[PDB]
Design a binder for these strands. Structure first.
Ligand SMILES: [Mg+2]
Ligand SMILES: [Mg+2]
Ligand SMILES: [Mg+2]
Ligand SMILES: [Mg+2]
Length: 150
RNA sequence: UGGAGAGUUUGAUCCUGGCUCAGGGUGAACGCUGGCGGCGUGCCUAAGACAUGCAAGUCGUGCGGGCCGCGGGGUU
């Protein structure tokens, strides 16, 4: 068990003679607040069920966010298709400035002091997906020179 | 020591893309309302037209006299 906050939920739909069937979507984040988080997307015939599946995959796929002072190691940019995200580390006592998507994800990941910018396609879903791969690719002075051994 | 976005093309999706909004600002004006003070600020329009008053003068230690009001006899 971790935190588990719910990003957004939508009602989609398809066609079929007679009318339109349906489906709901659940994009969800999860994190103790120690440097561990997981994003999960859940589709299901009903609101609650979907929100459930959310957390399930959420916990399934999670990442080691190497914090530091409560901020972040280095500044990075990542593009996920059409949606691009900028993560830039702030000094203690700043705030977590971001949209609902990147902020939510960033809170449970721990961070308290981070500068963020949401460029490109601002597709909620895709921003999330983007935010993760960002963290995923975070390095510390350690694992840095850990590769420049030889 | 510094960086948040959202609504809106579709049965739904993703993308592109414009329109729209929340902010801050002003020698402001307009509506409704209106108690006190301090500090600022107040014809952005017709460089249109203007009554009245004032905004530029001063030195008798540069010089000669006019009027007014002071004191003082050279030829008897
Ligand atoms: Mg691209
Ligand atoms: Mg069309
Ligand atoms: Mg419609
Ligand atoms: Mg003028």
């Amino acid at each position: 068990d971790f935190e588990e906050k719910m990003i957004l939920i939508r009602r989609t739909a398809r066609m079929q003679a007679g009318g339109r069937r349906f489906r709901f979507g659940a994009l969800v984040v999860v994190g103790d607040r120690q440097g561990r988080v997981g994003l999960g997307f859940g589709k299901a015939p009903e609101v609650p069920l979907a929100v459930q599946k959310a957390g399930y995959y959420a916990r399934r796929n999670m990442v080691e966010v190497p914090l530091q002072n409560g901020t972040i190691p280095h500044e990075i940019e990542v593009e996920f298709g059409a949606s691009k995200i900028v993560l830039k580390p702030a000094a203690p006592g700043t705030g977590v400035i971001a949209g609902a998507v990147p902020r939510a994800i960033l809170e449970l990941a721990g961070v308290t002091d981070i500068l963020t910018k949401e460029l490109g396609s601002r597709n909620p879903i895709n921003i999330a997906y983007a935010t993760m791969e960002a963290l995923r690719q975070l390095r510390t002075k350690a694992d840095v020179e850990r590769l420049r051994k030889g």
